[PDB]
Amino acid sequence: RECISIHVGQAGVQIGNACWELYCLEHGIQPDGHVPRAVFVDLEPTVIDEVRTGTYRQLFHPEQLITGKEDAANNYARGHYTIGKEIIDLVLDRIRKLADQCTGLQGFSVFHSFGGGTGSGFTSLLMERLSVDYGKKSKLEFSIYPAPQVSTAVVEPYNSILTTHTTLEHSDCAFMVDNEAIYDICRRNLDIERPTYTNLNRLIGQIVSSITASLRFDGALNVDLTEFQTNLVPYPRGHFPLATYAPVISAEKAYHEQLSVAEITNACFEPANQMVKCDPRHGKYMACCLLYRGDVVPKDVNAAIATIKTKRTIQFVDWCPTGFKVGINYEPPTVVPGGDLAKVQRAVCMLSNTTAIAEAWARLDHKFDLMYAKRAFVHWYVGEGMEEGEFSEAREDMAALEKDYEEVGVDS
Amino acid sequence: HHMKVVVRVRPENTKEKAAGFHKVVHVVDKHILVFDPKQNKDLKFVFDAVFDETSTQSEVFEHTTKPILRSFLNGYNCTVLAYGATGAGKTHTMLGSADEPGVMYLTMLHLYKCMDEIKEEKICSTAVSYLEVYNEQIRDLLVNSGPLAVREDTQKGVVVHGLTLHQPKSSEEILHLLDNGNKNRTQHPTDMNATSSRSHAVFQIYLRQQDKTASINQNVRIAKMSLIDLAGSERASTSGAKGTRFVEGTNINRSLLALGNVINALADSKRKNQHIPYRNSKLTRLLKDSLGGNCQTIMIAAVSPSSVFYDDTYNTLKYANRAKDIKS
Amino acid sequence: REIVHIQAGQCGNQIGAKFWEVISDEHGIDPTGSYHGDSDLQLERINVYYNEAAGNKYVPRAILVDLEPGTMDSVRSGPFGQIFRPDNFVFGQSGAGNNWAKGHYTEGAELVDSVLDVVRKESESCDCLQGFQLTHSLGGGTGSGMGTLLISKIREEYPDRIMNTFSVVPSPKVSDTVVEPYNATLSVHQLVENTDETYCIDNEALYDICFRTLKLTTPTYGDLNHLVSATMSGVTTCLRFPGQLNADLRKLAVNMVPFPRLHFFMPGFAPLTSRGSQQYRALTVPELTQQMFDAKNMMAACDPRHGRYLTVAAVFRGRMSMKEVDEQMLNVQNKNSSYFVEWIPNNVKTAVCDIPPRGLKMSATFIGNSTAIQELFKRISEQFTAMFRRKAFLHWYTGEGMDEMEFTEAESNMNDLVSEYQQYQD
Ligand SMILES: CC(=O)O[C@H]1C(=O)[C@@]2(C)[C@H]([C@H](OC(=O)c3ccccc3)[C@]3(O)C[C@H](OC(=O)[C@H](O)[C@@H](NC(=O)c4ccccc4)c4ccccc4)C(C)=C1C3(C)C)[C@]1(OC(C)=O)CO[C@@H]1C[C@@H]2O
Ligand SMILES: Nc1nc2c(ncn2[C@@H]2O[C@H](COP(=O)(O)OP(=O)(O)OP(=O)(O)O)[C@@H](O)[C@H]2O)c(=O)[nH]1
Ligand SMILES: Nc1nc2c(ncn2[C@@H]2O[C@H](COP(=O)(O)OP(=O)(O)O)[C@@H](O)[C@H]2O)c(=O)[nH]1
Ligand SMILES: O=[N+]([O-])c1cc(Cl)ccc1S(=O)(=O)c1ccccc1
Numbered sequence A: 001r002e003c004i005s006i007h008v009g010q011a012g013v014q015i016g017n018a019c020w021e022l023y024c025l026e027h028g029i030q031p032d033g034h035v036p037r038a039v040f041v042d043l044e045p046t047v048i049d050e051v052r053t054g055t056y057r058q059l060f061h062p063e064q065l066i067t068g069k070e071d072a073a074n075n076y077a078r079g080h081y082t083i084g085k086e087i088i089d090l091v092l093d094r095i096r097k098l099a100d101q102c103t104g105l106q107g108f109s110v111f112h113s114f115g116g117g118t119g120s121g122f123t124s125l126l127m128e129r130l131s132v133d134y135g136k137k138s139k140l141e142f143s144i145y146p147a148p149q150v151s152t153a154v155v156e157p158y159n160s161i162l163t164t165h166t167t168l169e170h171s172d173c174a175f176m177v178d179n180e181a182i183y184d185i186c187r188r189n190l191d192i193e194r195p196t197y198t199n200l201n202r203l204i205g206q207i208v209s210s211i212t213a214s215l216r217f218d219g220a221l222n223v224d225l226t227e228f229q230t231n232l233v234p235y236p237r238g239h240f241p242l243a244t245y246a247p248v249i250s251a252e253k254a255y256h257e258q259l260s261v262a263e264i265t266n267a268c269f270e271p272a273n274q275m276v277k278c279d280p281r282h283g284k285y286m287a288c289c290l291l292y293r294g295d296v297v298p299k300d301v302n303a304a305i306a307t308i309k310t311k312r313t314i315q316f317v318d319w320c321p322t323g324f325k326v327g328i329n330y331e332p333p334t335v336v337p338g339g340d341l342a343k344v345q346r347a348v349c350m351l352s353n354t355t356a357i358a359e360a361w362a363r364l365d366h367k368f369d370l371m372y373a374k375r376a377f378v379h380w381y382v383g384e385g386m387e388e389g390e391f392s393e394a395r396e397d398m399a400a401l402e403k404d405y406e407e408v409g410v411d412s
Numbered sequence B: 001h002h003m004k005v006v007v008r009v010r011p012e013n014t015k016e017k018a019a020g021f022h023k024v025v026h027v028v029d030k031h032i033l034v035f036d037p038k039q040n041k042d043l044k045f046v047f048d049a050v051f052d053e054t055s056t057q058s059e060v061f062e063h064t065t066k067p068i069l070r071s072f073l074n075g076y077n078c079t080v081l082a083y084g085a086t087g088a089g090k091t092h093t094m095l096g097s098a099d100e101p102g103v104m105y106l107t108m109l110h111l112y113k114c115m116d117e118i119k120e121e122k123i124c125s126t127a128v129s130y131l132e133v134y135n136e137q138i139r140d141l142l143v144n145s146g147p148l149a150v151r152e153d154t155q156k157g158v159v160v161h162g163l164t165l166h167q168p169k170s171s172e173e174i175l176h177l178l179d180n181g182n183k184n185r186t187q188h189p190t191d192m193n194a195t196s197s198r199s200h201a202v203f204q205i206y207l208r209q210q211d212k213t214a215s216i217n218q219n220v221r222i223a224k225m226s227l228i229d230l231a232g233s234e235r236a237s238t239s240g241a242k243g244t245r246f247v248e249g250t251n252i253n254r255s256l257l258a259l260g261n262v263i264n265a266l267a268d269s270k271r272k273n274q275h276i277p278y279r280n281s282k283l284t285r286l287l288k289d290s291l292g293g294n295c296q297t298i299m300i301a302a303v304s305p306s307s308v309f310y311d312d313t314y315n316t317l318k319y320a321n322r323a324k325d326i327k328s
Numbered sequence C: 001r002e003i004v005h006i007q008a009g010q011c012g013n014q015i016g017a018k019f020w021e022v023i024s025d026e027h028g029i030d031p032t033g034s035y036h037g038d039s040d041l042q043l044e045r046i047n048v049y050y051n052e053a054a055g056n057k058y059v060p061r062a063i064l065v066d067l068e069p070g071t072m073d074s075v076r077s078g079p080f081g082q083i084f085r086p087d088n089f090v091f092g093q094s095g096a097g098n099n100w101a102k103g104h105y106t107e108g109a110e111l112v113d114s115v116l117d118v119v120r121k122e123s124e125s126c127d128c129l130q131g132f133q134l135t136h137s138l139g140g141g142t143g144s145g146m147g148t149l150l151i152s153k154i155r156e157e158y159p160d161r162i163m164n165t166f167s168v169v170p171s172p173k174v175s176d177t178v179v180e181p182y183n184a185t186l187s188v189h190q191l192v193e194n195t196d197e198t199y200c201i202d203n204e205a206l207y208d209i210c211f212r213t214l215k216l217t218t219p220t221y222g223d224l225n226h227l228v229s230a231t232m233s234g235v236t237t238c239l240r241f242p243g244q245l246n247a248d249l250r251k252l253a254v255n256m257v258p259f260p261r262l263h264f265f266m267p268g269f270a271p272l273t274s275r276g277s278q279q280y281r282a283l284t285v286p287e288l289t290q291q292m293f294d295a296k297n298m299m300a301a302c303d304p305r306h307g308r309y310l311t312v313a314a315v316f317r318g319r320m321s322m323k324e325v326d327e328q329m330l331n332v333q334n335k336n337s338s339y340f341v342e343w344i345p346n347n348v349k350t351a352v353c354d355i356p357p358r359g360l361k362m363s364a365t366f367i368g369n370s371t372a373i374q375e376l377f378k379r380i381s382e383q384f385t386a387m388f389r390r391k392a393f394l395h396w397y398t399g400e401g402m403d404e405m406e407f408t409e410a411e412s413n414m415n416d417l418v419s420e421y422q423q424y425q426d
């Protein structure tokens, strides 16, 4: 029934505070109500301290707020091996204390930021220790993969080729949201050259609400978390669907709002709206879980999708006859009281595996090689209990992920 | 070229043999070895020579060290690069194996014989040293030294002063330096107590030839030879958080990285030149003197057939072959 | 997390008075007074530089290392001079002779054990240590000799904790000392093998940046040192604030040193406008990246236009969009693809604190690891050979128990350090 969450790394905690804000906001639970169902992990105290100081302060137990006062380091090795090791036992102890208290759970919605130190390296072993202690559950990791050109950390690819290889054999379905291809939505589909990080976090805060919050909630076409990985992963690699939202309209500028189903569904497959710089450049969709919420007739959907199945310029995979998980919830979306989000009476939070990430992975892998070809910042991980092995051998790993996402499509 | 590489597989260990789970590499023929037998990765690897598990110390002696001795006698400085998995057993029986004929024993005798013949015909004099790199401090094994200070001569070929060499009387005198040395290094108390595996042992022999046939007043040819036992790589577990390993593992991890980066850069400097940063480690700077130049070199990797060696022997074959395979 | 500063030699000490003059206002700490802080945030992280004893007396956790009494006796007898616990003054009333050997082997070598004693009293203070800040000049006995020994001992006691160095590399045009390259070549030699972050600052690069970028006609030393201390605050203490994307000394190190030599950086501050008129407030953000990435405005002597970058760290501190930051850095990377190196897809390390430098709206410290600094260790190494060939003032070093091989060693190392830096310019 339930799904724990584990918000790891500063960014996995900033998005965490925002997904966690949107929750109580659509459930009538003000600053001090019930109790959360998650934990927070960082090797930098000052950030989890923003959840201990700022808004949502007393909505958490100081027990679900793990910190290592020590050092974050923007390097996988340190954050996986060396330092992030010391904290793991204590972290697990919460996702084993919180996992016992509940009633017949389904999994853990992990929140991490791929190209970090605590968001890469620690979660790699956290998800590692989960797939063994609870191999009988869902492991849906919600990642914020590296921006395609607007990366931050100089090493980013070293951290994100190492979170992918170690988590790959451990996740069930990895949601992805690209930080830059969101800013294009903030510029083009909302009109603001002032996107604070606090806004991208409202937007993932929104798509994510559609995943757990409203779908674990009753509706005309409910969709358990197990239903995702079943209807969404064609193969055992921890396959990485993309998150997309539909009524991303501005709460000030334009106002057509009343954009019946037939429109909001079409607004998902246009590449300029999908929180990911994986524009469907060739990438065949292979399975899509269209989560709807608000006032939606099942015939409007079983017609608004039928039109799309016959657009052909949307080319689904060959071995997939029908790859359209319709999920219908009742309660409309619930926008922030005065952020910037429109507030419509319906939305489409479609997510899907696409052969498109054959690109995104290739462009992120090629990055890694250019520095590893010179060793670059390698002495920063080797001095932290890693080897020529874990780099070269996690590089060979993602090489068979460039081939997997090629072979599962492009061919018939 | 000058570089030639041979990898000698060592028999599976009594316990490894009796279990038998998927073999790390499955040696196909003598030279070609397949990695990850069924599919799986199924990676063929070629080497310049390769010796099978049946090939003992005596066969590797004759192969590896014969082009070494000839070049060493010629006055070309030689080196042997050891490798092996991190797990002992293959490396344990590869080096210091008294029972095994010893690549080092038969090559020490091989040189020792050839040295006596060059001395009778010509005036040849030699000397030897034995040092380790533990904690990135050079220790002499012969004398209890402290941290050898660095100077540079007129050539400025970087010298750790305070090294003592004695002239090789017999192989027996060398055996006393090997014994003194091998007990001078500590075991590593982490895991099972290994030898000084984690510390790099260096053996040095210096040949000095004057010709009786040539005029007394001539150039002298000297070569340096070195044999290096290296550590294995450390995992998270074999590392550990512990402060006791902590210093040692930091010394090894930077020595392995800077050394192996200098080996990759060494292969690039078989094209290149001053590029290769000798300076990145103390010993890697002395390794320029031996391995740099157009000197005849060989690498001997160890490989075990055990499944335990899956990771370690694959990483060592990967790293050894990576420097060969990269050419621009 | 925590750090312990180190005021080696007179210059590092004189700067120490300016570093602590600034940082204390950036933390509301009056002379012996407490946190008067205009806010409440300039206190949740002070521990980085101070200690709790009374309840109004947060004392700077630095070390004052000098063989010249009259120096520390001018820093302690002036403004903030009465904040340091007297235990921090590691004086050496000996002759502070201008010889690197006199401060490293003979007269500094005695005083070291009575320094290391206190460097341990302050490192064993509480919580977790991060590293040590070091200030000094590479042009004198107590700066380059003794201050380079202090680190060769620190890096043996805590090879885990980081080591930032703020070196006053000998300025080109005019040397403020004669033996200068001797004191310098011998300290940079220790630096390339112990500290792991260096910020090289040049008294004349400052004069240019302080007489043309500030219309300031009478740039006193207090002003040079003030400008320097403005950067080293935007490095350390700054990132010990909150931020949408904060870093710390390790993130700086682990993004900025591609190769273990240590590498030396070239700091640059953002809003560097003359007082009254030039208060243009053209500080939206493109004006800060305009500032930091020009030639002039680098506290180094060498111009970045003369060599690729390996890494950059724009450590912004002032509320700004994570779009107009992360965006601007890109157009800067593409307009100048020529000088930025290519085997690093993203050279730039964006870093963003929230709170700005007390009285300002928006700033950004720049920390450039450019290969252009090759054209300075060249300079120093030239001045060495031109005089080392004739053994110029060498009898002042050998006569203090030195080696003819020690000068050879340091030149050859730091002259190899020039060679290596070119391997990436190509
Ligand atoms: C009325 C007003 O706004 O005055 C400004 C001002 O006029 C200007 C010109 C300041 C002024 O700075 C200088 O003139 C200066 C003098 C010597 C060396 C370097 C600079 C200022 O003195 C400096 C002062 O800086 C700060 O308050 C920061 O917090 C800064 N503090 C110090 O450097 C400091 C000075 C004295 C005592 C203690 C601290 C800081 C910067 C980085 C990290 C930590 C602290 C500011 C904004 C101003 C005055 C007061 C005129 C400027 O400098 C700084 C560092 O902000 C020079 O160009 C900038 C632009 C500012 O607008
Ligand atoms: N959407 C979104 N992305 C963020 C946020 N914060 C950071 N990121 C992105 O995530 C990455 C940053 O990771 P860091 O903050 O450096 O590190 P961390 O993963 O928290 O862990 P450490 O490296 O140990 O500090 C960059 O690619 C950022 O663009 C956030 O609040 N929202
Ligand atoms: N920026 C700056 N440089 C200084 C200061 N004092 C001395 N210097 C520089 O330091 C060099 C001289 O070394 P000095 O500090 O006297 O050495 P020491 O006192 O014997 O350790 C010269 O290059 C000076 O320009 C200062 O207060 N600020
Ligand atoms: O290679 N080694 O340096 C080495 C490393 C270890 Cl752990 C052990 C031994 C040797 S040896 O000198 O080859 C040697 C070989 C035979 C007898 C004594 C010493």
Ligand SMILES: [Mg+2]
Binding pocket: A009, A010, A011, A042, A044, A047, A072, A118
């Ligand atoms: Mg963080």
Ligand SMILES: [Zn+2]
Binding pocket: A255, A256, A257, A258
């Ligand atoms: Zn309308």
